UniProtKB/Swiss-Prot annotation, chain A:
GO molecular function, one term: toxin activity
Gene3D superfamilies per the UniProt record, alphabetical: Mannose-Binding Protein A, subunit A
Major location category of this protein: secreted
Cysteine disulfide partners in this protein: C2-C13, C30-C115, C92-C107
Entry keywords, A to Z: Disulfide bond, Hemostasis impairing toxin, Platelet aggregation activating toxin, Secreted, Toxin
Pfam families: Lectin_C
Extent of the signal sequence: none
PANTHER family: MANNOSE, PHOSPHOLIPASE, LECTIN RECEPTOR RELATED
Assembly: Heterodimer of subunits alpha and beta; disulfide-linked. Botrocetin and vWF form a soluble complex.
Top-rank taxon, per record: Eukaryota
Protein's recorded name: Snaclec botrocetin subunit beta
Curated annotation (Swiss-Prot), chain B:
Assembly and interaction partners: Heterodimer of subunits alpha and beta; disulfide-linked. Botrocetin and vWF form a soluble complex.
Location of this chain's protein in the cell: Secreted
Keyword Secreted: yes
Annotated function: Snaclec that binds to von Willebrand factor (VWF) and induces its interaction with GPIbalpha (GP1BA) (via the vWF A1 domain), resulting in platelet aggregation.
PANTHER family hit by this protein: MANNOSE, PHOSPHOLIPASE, LECTIN RECEPTOR RELATED
Species: Bothrops jararaca (Jararaca)
Protein name according to UniProt: Snaclec botrocetin subunit alpha
Limits of the C-type lectin domain: 9-129
Curated annotation (Swiss-Prot), chain C:
Disulfide bonds: C8-C194
Name assigned to this protein: von Willebrand factor
Domain VWFA, chain residue ranges per copy: 13-189
Highest taxon above the source species: Eukaryota
Amino acid sequence: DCPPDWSSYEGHCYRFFKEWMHWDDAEEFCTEQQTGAHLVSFQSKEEADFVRSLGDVVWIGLSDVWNKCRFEWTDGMEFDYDDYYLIAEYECVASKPTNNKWWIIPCTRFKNFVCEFQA
Amino acid sequence: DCPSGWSSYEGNCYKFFQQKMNWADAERFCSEQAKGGHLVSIKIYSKEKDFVGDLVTKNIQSSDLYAWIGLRVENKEKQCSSEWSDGSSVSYENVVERTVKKCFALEKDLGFVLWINLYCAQKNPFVCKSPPP
Amino acid sequence: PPLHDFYCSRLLDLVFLLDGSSRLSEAEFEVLKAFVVDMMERLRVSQKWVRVAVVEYHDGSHAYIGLKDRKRPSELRRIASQVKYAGSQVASTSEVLKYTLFQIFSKIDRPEASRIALLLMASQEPQRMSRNFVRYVQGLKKKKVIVIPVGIGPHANLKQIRLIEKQAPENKAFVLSSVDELEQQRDEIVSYLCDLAPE
């Protein structure tokens, strides 16, 4: 149901890429493949298994996981989020097809990844 | 006006402790040092920044690289990304705990003035802050 | 001989930092270069009074003029007016601040003069290149280098412009709609940063 070299699963197209890029490039690269393609995203374990079926960690669709957080001081100090710019490490999520455990690591890291989309 | 070993600034008392503890034990420890005591809170764009900065530099009687402060990620989740890069909301998660960095600390370089989020279970020295008794 | 009624005759090290991203077209990058040539026209250029440096930054940086270059103010103005249009996809403010910090001001051999970095921003660098942004802005502040963010257009990194104006009291921001305001605001900017340098 999908293009050449890609793989199909539940109306969705996947494809591992043995190319070393940082999260943002991996993500962008995916989007430049097909209209509607992103870094793989797991909405259930099953979906993960199929991706495993396709170093040690691959980029998945989770970006800037810390700066998208809410912050609070232990003494309830009041602050203006506008002042908290890039305050936390810029980190992204990489998967380990083996144990299937996700690692939150620096987005600048170079990891192989998997793209995904729907026809 | 502040107690023994504590420094004072804009109305409060500050103290650097070398004892290395995880973020949560450091927070509890500071609350027992005084009524209204907590891991130091810092107004990002202020002079309290350099005060606390100097306090830790000329006291960090160790080569430690971090000093816990009272700021912490507030979300209960292990990572605060609501949706994936596609758009799908996040619900199924499988994040490795030892990888979550929700507790903040002062960084050594530039003199403990820059913040950095770390893995809370980590043990670091800290700065306490309580209002004058 | 001073070309205009304004001739900042103070002790100053002024560093012009120009966005080299495609966010500015080739024609727009021209107005900006013209803006730079003007400031230089309203400064007293020479190793004694005002010293200038001109940098075009992209993912990396290209320095056309350094503070120690010994050249007539006319030559330097010619050089700046000949700065090649980069048009790169990225203009890293972080990296050009790092360059300003660790190279342009590697050593501070002119303590008697004010050190200013005029950051002419027209874009937003990828978040992954900003880890050390604050670190560099802070490093700059310790060496008494004033950073004056000049936002140009709807793509300038407002968040960074804002943060910078904060980090240090002297750091003041100038936000503009386009490069058409550079001259509409040239005199205020020159006057402002000239009153930050010693007599």
